[PDB]
Ligand binder design. Structure first.
Ligand SMILES: [Fe+2]
Ligand SMILES: [Fe+2]
Ligand SMILES: [Fe+2]
Ligand SMILES: [Fe+2]
Lengths: 306, 306, 306, 306
């Protein structure tokens, strides 16, 4: 897999659509040196620092990182990366992991406020383990379905993993989904359906949008999640239960281990993600970090006025 | 009473307008078998499963259940069912009772969010007993009067009953109400009045609508409840107190025992419901479950475009 | 003072503008008999009962009560009543006091929701005593200044009084105010000023209205309170501090003792009210009840359509 | 420095733009005498009293105070005062300090509600010491950036200071900022950016406005704060991080000690303020008071109608 300045990039073992990007040891060391003056707390309080750490990392890769991240994420044939930095691979370096993921995400867009943490990222710990039963699979879905704005990317980092069996990230690229055409050509694929937010501590209003939509070239994209979609009647409800089964039993699903220090960064429009079951263990300890946001990048394109 | 595939249907002892629908033992056993993979918690989280369990039950009745439920509920001369399934009749099977009621309701419509439980249904326990005094009758009324959208059906299931004397459901079909014409022809019957929600934990705004309205054929329907209607002056207030007395002392009221495992499912537009007084007992235990929603079904009717 | 059916009416000792209305012993006894089936809790839950108790009391006075209350409250030369019922005069009869005041208020209008109690009336107890210092006078003001809708009447009942020295209700009829013309003819009298609600537990938005306004005949009326008016600058602020002093030192102020069982019922548009200082006492106990609302009554007047 | 009636005014040692205004001992004594009838609690409850105390102080200076405060604050070459009153200089006189600052502020405008205290001013105590680390500089910024309305002035008073080393107020007048022209002429200086409020306990909605704007003569003014500005992408984020560094390392920054009893009163449009680091000490005690508001004053200018 191609050799770039400051990192290497190779196809994963689960699929050619998922590329593995690894920052070299030298790059990692220099980046950590160069962002040491800003604790994670500074990035939380001053959002411009999230972009600044991104600039520092991209400059360390001779400005080849930003364009490669964008090309990969916007490429319909790919759209997903598994990213890591040599030397960042233990729970003790959680702050460095956050800085690294923040730098990468802010070269391609901006991470949105997360209601679970009150910050631009959220860290979650699973230990001492309906929705949190270890034997339960978290079904494949897209993020951001209960708000008006589109979530373009999902970032999921493994911060810690102790006594963990299973729990791989599940992924499904729409073009690997064998039932795509059947569901996409159904009239219900284009009908606006109600999507309702969870608890919501005084934060929302229901939104309406179809389960499928199209990209700029007319190819199918999805905005689906079983828990938040609210079928209005028996017609919508039975169809969605069939859609759900068609997605969950798809032969195109990928099962991707995400070792400590690594993170998945995927295009949320044509990739769905979920999580496999895992075995309970008294000393199990799993810590994750997530960021979700929109893409924001430059291109030669039209404008009006001056 | 007619024999259908998977159930029987006979007129109640309180009125020919109230039909009793009983699912046979075989049907019940097969339904429970076929929905065992989904705990009630799964139905709570994924609303399409509520419709799926309905499909499973209707398919078990050779698709004769859905049409019969609809015909009965939409029929002005009837509009009410008392439903049960042979073998489901003890508090220990509360989850099965919820699944059964959910299946039936979602063949004819969709159950709305319930603010008391935060779910699509609510379970309530009365034990160790102004509004909760056992000697007090809960006056006849319609549900959904403080919101803009119309509540078409009310579902009330008895989950448990121990040392309970009295407490029958009270019902009043508008066409059995001897004072209907007198109140309906009064000008105040058509005046929009203010209706205000209870406590409301940051959830509402007052709504305005008349106490009476009409169905598609021009027959009287009601949207009334003594607690939430808010007469603006002495004219409205005295008239409503007379209306209230005319309803509560009506000779057309039905008193219907609802044994454990059974549920009333009524058309909320032309049926009012309430609850009779019951005697306090140190070891009294009464558990109810409710669902309220709108009808949603197919018919050959007009549409525009393609 | 005139003899009516069921009550007597005589001018107060503080002013001919304030009339004292006393229900006879027979009237009181019959009213209490006739409203015994409804606890105060029933009136709280079913607002039509507030009007029904009013009807019962007015019918006991051969329908002469409603017209007299209205004529008095709407009469610019009067506009205030001090009301009591023979036999209702001890804290033990607080429920009867609430019923009586409720009956009177609902013959002339409707009492609004009170945020302090969550009900249509509020009861307050002062004991073990900046705003609650006993040596502090509560300045004269009008109620309802921080909402858009107009509050036409204020009702203040004394429920209990033990070891209480001072604390009389203060009243000021605008036509007894010697500085009325000076302030009313100032340009700031007609300038819309900002009024802001207290704490507000998620309930309001600021409102704007002038400190003075006019009745239907062009006579001055006021909508003023020192605590909630919010002068936007030094011009408004200095003028309002002068207005405040001109009102508080007015020679037209009345000081009215309100014995247990009695209540003031005043027109809030041209009467301002406040409360005099009182002496602290370890065993002091003062309990008040208030209701505030709008007038709603019939008159021969124009309408459109049919 | 000029001698006025009741006070003296001289240029500070940090800059000729910052004038020091000191009320004489006689003025101070007479003012305190004349406002003794109103506790601070009275000013909190009745906003017109804030203007009244201002009138009392200005009248004591033969009405020369109001015009001088305004001329100084509106003068682009100055715009900042350091104010004190002889005899008010110890934490025990905190109430007198509040009254004094209130009087001054309300001669030139009105202080806005402060969400931290729920009052028109807020008092804060720092003792037993990311944002509250003593070694951390609070970056230079303008107040009021996350609301639509403009904050014209910032008032910062030192109420108490014990065992305090460092912690000076930092100030930067835009015309002393050597990089002003570079940043002001950049296209991003005029682009509306998103500004988001902190926690907010059910109080806001995001606002959009550029980081720079212009005064009535076209001279640069700023509305900036690193914590609340929310760059939407890498372009905005990198530019703002450069702006931030250009401001924080400016050679035009002033470092102003604010002794107990003194207060800074600055024009928030062309002055930025911050706070220097201070050394932790077990017995450190620092108490501040702030007020923020808009200017409101008279001038000969046009109007329409009558
Ligand atoms: Fe997710
Ligand atoms: Fe009900
Ligand atoms: Fe009041
Ligand atoms: Fe500040």
């Amino acid at each position: 897999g191609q050799d770039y300045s400051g990192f290497t990039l190779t196809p994963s073992a689960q699929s050619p659509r998922l590329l593995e990007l690894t920052f070299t040891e030298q790059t990692t060391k220099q980046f950590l040196e160069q962002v040491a003056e800003w604790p994670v707390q500074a990035l939380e309080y001053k959002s411009f620092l999230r972009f600044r750490v991104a600039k520092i990392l991209d400059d360390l890769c001779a400005n080849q990182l930003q364009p490669l991240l964008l090309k990969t994420l916007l490429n319909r044939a790919e759209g997903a990366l598994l990213i890591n930095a040599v030397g960042v691979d233990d729970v003790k370096q959680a702050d460095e992991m956050v800085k690294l993921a923040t730098a990468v995400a802010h070269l391609i867009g901006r991470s949105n406020f997360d209601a679970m943490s009150g910050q631009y990222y959220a860290r979650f710990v699973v230990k001492n383990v309906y929705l949190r039963q270890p034997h339960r699979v978290m079904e494949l879905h897209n993020d951001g379905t209960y708000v008006e704005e589109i979530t373009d990317y999902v970032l999921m980092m493994k911060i810690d993993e102790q006594n963990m069996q299973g729990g791989n990230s599940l992924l499904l690229h729409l073009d690997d989904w064998e039932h795509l055409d059947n569901y996409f050509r159904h009239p219900l694929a284009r009908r606006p359906m109600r999507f309702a937010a969870p608890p919501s501590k005084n934060v929302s209003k229901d939104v309406f949008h179809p389960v499928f939509d199209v990209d700029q070239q007319g190819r199918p994209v999805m905005r689906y999640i079983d828990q938040f979609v609210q079928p209005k009647d028996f017609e919508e409800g039975v169809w969605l239960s069939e859609l759900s089964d068609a997605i969950e039993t798809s032969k195109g699903i990928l099962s991707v281990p995400v070792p400590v220090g690594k993170f998945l960064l995927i295009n949320n429009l044509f990739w769905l993600h979920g999580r496999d079951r895992f075995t309970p263990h008294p000393d199990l300890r799993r810590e994750l970090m997530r960021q979700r946001g929109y893409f924001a990048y430059a291109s030669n394109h039209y404008q009006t006025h001056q």
